Design an enzyme around this catalytic site. Structure first.
Site, PDB file in Angstrom:
ATOM      1  N   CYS A  40       0.824  -1.004  -0.216  1.00 43.36           N
ATOM      2  CA  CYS A  40      -0.032  -0.017  -0.238  1.00 43.36           C
ATOM      3  C   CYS A  40       0.869   1.165   0.006  1.00 43.36           C
ATOM      4  O   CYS A  40       1.864   1.251   0.773  1.00 43.36           O
ATOM      5  CB  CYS A  40      -0.774  -0.113   1.385  1.00 43.36           C
ATOM      6  SG  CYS A  40      -2.027   1.518   1.214  1.00 43.36           S
TER       7      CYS A  40
ATOM      8  N   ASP B 124       0.277   3.611   1.553  1.00 45.31           N
ATOM      9  CA  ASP B 124       0.525   4.070   3.059  1.00 45.31           C
ATOM     10  C   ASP B 124       1.970   3.847   3.597  1.00 45.31           C
ATOM     11  O   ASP B 124       2.582   4.623   4.362  1.00 45.31           O
ATOM     12  CB  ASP B 124      -0.454   3.581   4.089  1.00 45.31           C
ATOM     13  CG  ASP B 124      -1.879   4.247   4.045  1.00 45.31           C
ATOM     14  OD1 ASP B 124      -1.952   5.269   3.738  1.00 45.31           O
ATOM     15  OD2 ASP B 124      -2.957   3.389   4.098  1.00 45.31           O
TER      16      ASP B 124
ATOM     17  N   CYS C 229      -5.562   0.136   7.233  1.00 41.87           N
ATOM     18  CA  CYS C 229      -5.275   0.852   6.172  1.00 41.87           C
ATOM     19  C   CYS C 229      -6.264   1.947   5.756  1.00 41.87           C
ATOM     20  O   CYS C 229      -7.256   1.862   5.961  1.00 41.87           O
ATOM     21  CB  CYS C 229      -5.361  -0.147   5.020  1.00 41.87           C
ATOM     22  SG  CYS C 229      -5.118   0.571   3.245  1.00 41.87           S
TER      23      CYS C 229
ATOM     24  N   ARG D 114       3.199   2.093   5.853  1.00 39.30           N
ATOM     25  CA  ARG D 114       3.340   2.441   7.469  1.00 39.30           C
ATOM     26  C   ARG D 114       4.818   1.846   7.873  1.00 39.30           C
ATOM     27  O   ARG D 114       5.395   2.626   8.523  1.00 39.30           O
ATOM     28  CB  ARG D 114       2.164   1.711   8.291  1.00 39.30           C
ATOM     29  CG  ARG D 114       0.863   2.330   7.952  1.00 39.30           C
ATOM     30  CD  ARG D 114       0.773   3.998   7.819  1.00 39.30           C
ATOM     31  NE  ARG D 114       0.714   4.355   9.115  1.00 39.30           N
ATOM     32  CZ  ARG D 114       0.806   5.464   9.582  1.00 39.30           C
ATOM     33  NH1 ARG D 114       0.691   6.443   8.551  1.00 39.30           N
ATOM     34  NH2 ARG D 114       0.970   6.076  10.837  1.00 39.30           N
TER      35      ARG D 114
ATOM     36  N   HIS E  93      -2.226  -3.844   5.284  1.00 39.50           N
ATOM     37  CA  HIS E  93      -2.241  -3.786   6.724  1.00 39.50           C
ATOM     38  C   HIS E  93      -3.164  -3.119   7.423  1.00 39.50           C
ATOM     39  O   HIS E  93      -4.088  -2.563   6.895  1.00 39.50           O
ATOM     40  CB  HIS E  93      -0.721  -2.706   6.805  1.00 39.50           C
ATOM     41  CG  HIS E  93      -1.365  -1.413   6.202  1.00 39.50           C
ATOM     42  ND1 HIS E  93      -1.628  -0.189   6.870  1.00 39.50           N
ATOM     43  CD2 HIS E  93      -1.144  -1.110   4.935  1.00 39.50           C
ATOM     44  CE1 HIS E  93      -1.760   0.884   5.971  1.00 39.50           C
ATOM     45  NE2 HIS E  93      -1.614   0.093   4.803  1.00 39.50           N
TER      46      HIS E  93
HETATM   47  K   LIG Z   1       2.055  -0.555   3.730  1.00 40.56           K
HETATM   48 ZN   LIG Z   2      -3.035   1.488   3.402  1.00 40.65          ZN
END
Ligand SMILES: [K+]
Ligand SMILES: [Zn+2]
Ligand SMILES: [K+]
Ligand SMILES: [K+]
Ligand SMILES: [K+]
Ligand SMILES: [Zn+2]
Ligand SMILES: [Zn+2]
Ligand SMILES: [Zn+2]
Lengths: 211, 211, 211, 211
Positions: A41, A43, A100, A45, A97
């Site tokens: 993704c 994101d 998300c 993280r 994840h």
């Molecule tokens: K990720």
């Molecule tokens: Zn995400």
């Protein structure tokens, strides 16, 4: 951290590599073809290299919102076809994840603009597994949709002509569906690992059954 | 490194975080909206977090083959619109790298399959700056095309309705064009930094002029 | 004409076919694979069947704004690959039209919303042939860009892996670049007719030279 | 019919218009903004103008394989946003046809190449309505999937941010789902006509219920 801080940190980091790890770029200069493709993704993280410990040059990476493999996304499909046919990666890893932002935005469905069209593919999955999510407590529905999303993107990837042709030719390519949380960074194997057309359909129903 | 090695390394890495950095996930749990969007190449020779030192949760990441911002790539456009309108990132960084396999494959033009269509956008740039590359030594043509590619993707990004609308609304969004090599990992600023419609056109011609 | 008028006209038209042309659908029921693919504009000022007199079942049709063949438009590429590999069409016709709203909107460049990203591909062509348009009177610039647009989409189509592979296999596929105006509906051959990789590059420069 | 026959027929047809209908282009020269957008299949078995009797200049047309409105197809989305926001069409018509080669190719699932990825969206619908098709005779399954496909594309179109925003602004835009067969050319209204967010969801379930 401003822009000047990133540039200056990069310069200092590059200079300190002569003492810490002067061979940091030797595997890169030796043209190490990566054996892994990571579809994650945007994101991001926790970075994939931090999660798995893969060193530079070992990981081919594609990232979109909520790690999707849309049937007709030529962006993601071009990354896959390049990694499979040219680089000949032996493993493709799709990793979501929990928590998300894209998965959550698809459920809450706010007016976010152009991205809502992209998120409609998640709502298709959220609609598809409506009966499965009903048999579960409410507090676990969103994390499970994150897992279901990964399982469906693995399903889509295996259904693409790129993977169908590679498996027909006999290439050793394995698809994996993973997920992690920012509570420990522990990778969870969703157990939809596919090596051919048969294991793809077999392990997809196995992942749906475990939920 | 097999699949089992990555999973086992992740488990051991997650457990050792309790002693090394137990607050490794605190900024992630506090929902730190990232201030930076990184548009890089899927090659990912050196990770963006390793280049800049950005910690987890600070970087929104999109990666495609040869870090492209195609006018009509809804994948990349969805990442941008989400980062700009929802996350409200203050900086967008497009970063290529010298020796990029996608840039090189566009020049040598081998029959690689589906990816060749994606690479046709680079050949458009390689055709566009034909007169500029002629005034240069042969050994520097390919690295310059890598820089020209980044400058054109910055140009495309600034021309998209997402950036045109954000700059019209008054959002503080800055586009950057960077490049690095695996000979030192040193980030090079291509100096096409754009903060509005005027600086976008101004610094684009400035980057082309410096070459 | 409301919705009810179209439905009622269709019913009456279908019934009157028993007397006028009861064999109107015989070639359709006999599964007549079309020999022509028409890539036109969504404006559809004069229908392709009306321009050429092609009867039902003889024309495969794709239409987008300003008849574009973007390198990475999987929509248009899927229509082409299906028409070439499955239907085995012998001719592909890309046809623009003078006064096209999409071509004009790209030049005037108003804030029209999402479509502006799609129109950026035309402005790339309008930028590419800037020196050619300068040697011409102002009143003829916009109609020539309409022709240049068609020539470039023919160029893009011939450069796609679909056409490169079909010509490599030896399939008899011919690409045509046409244009018409609503002042007479007369089709104009832009003379960029391509039958292989060599004639594609040859007739592209020939069409640019005639302008 | 060769290429020379189409060109020569067009010239003769254009000249004969002076006697038959010299005002054939008057509505076109008067810049008649079309009130209808037609989203049909590239098969184009019977042209939309022939089915409905719409004269030139009255119909905006998009055509892809099996008349799809994919969530993330910027090609089709650009045609819609242009027709809705700029042209301000009052009706959008999605029209499939029984015996569609794309719908059939999705069910039989042969190795046709790149188009199979595009056809995976139909198989998603064919999977989605598996329980509905089971309650029906086998001989009617394929024609019903053609209708279900149209109903789902109408559903997708109404869910896009383009239609959500236009209905939120108060624009009078109506979506229609139609189908026809080459046995009579008779248009069949699938009765999923949507004028806003509420009627979209209401008439979607109404169309599914009628089947
Ligand atoms: K990720
Ligand atoms: Zn995400
Ligand atoms: K990189
Ligand atoms: K037209
Ligand atoms: K049709
Ligand atoms: Zn690269
Ligand atoms: Zn047009
Ligand atoms: Zn069809």
């Amino acid at each position: 951290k401003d822009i000047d801080t990133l540039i200056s940190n990069n310069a200092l980091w590059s200079k300190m590599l002569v003492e810490e790890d002067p061979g940091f770029f030797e595997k890169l200069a030796q043209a190490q073809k990566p054996r892994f493709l990571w579809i994650g993704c945007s994101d991001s993280r926790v970075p994939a290299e931090r999660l798995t410990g893969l060193e530079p040059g070992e990981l081919f990476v594609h990232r979109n919102v909520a790690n999707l493999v849309i049937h007709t996304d030529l962006n993601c499909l071009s990354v896959v076809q390049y990694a499979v046919d040219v680089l000949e990666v032996e493993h493709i890893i799709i990793c979501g994840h929990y928590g998300c932002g894209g998965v959550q935005a698809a459920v809450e469905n706010p007016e976010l603009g152009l991205i809502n069209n992209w998120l409609l593919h998640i709502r298709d999955i959220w609609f598809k597994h409506s009966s499965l999510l009903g048999e579960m407590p409410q507090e676990r529905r969103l994390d499970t949709l994150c897992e279901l999303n990964v399982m469906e993107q693995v399903y889509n990837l295996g259904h693409s002509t790129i993977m169908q042709s590679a498996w027909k030719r006999g290439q050793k390519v394995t698809i994996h569906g993973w997920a992690y949380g920012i509570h420990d960074g522990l990778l969870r194997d969703l157990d939809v690992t596919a090596t051919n057309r048969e294991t793809l359909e077999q392990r997809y129903r196995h992942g749906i059954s475990n939920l």
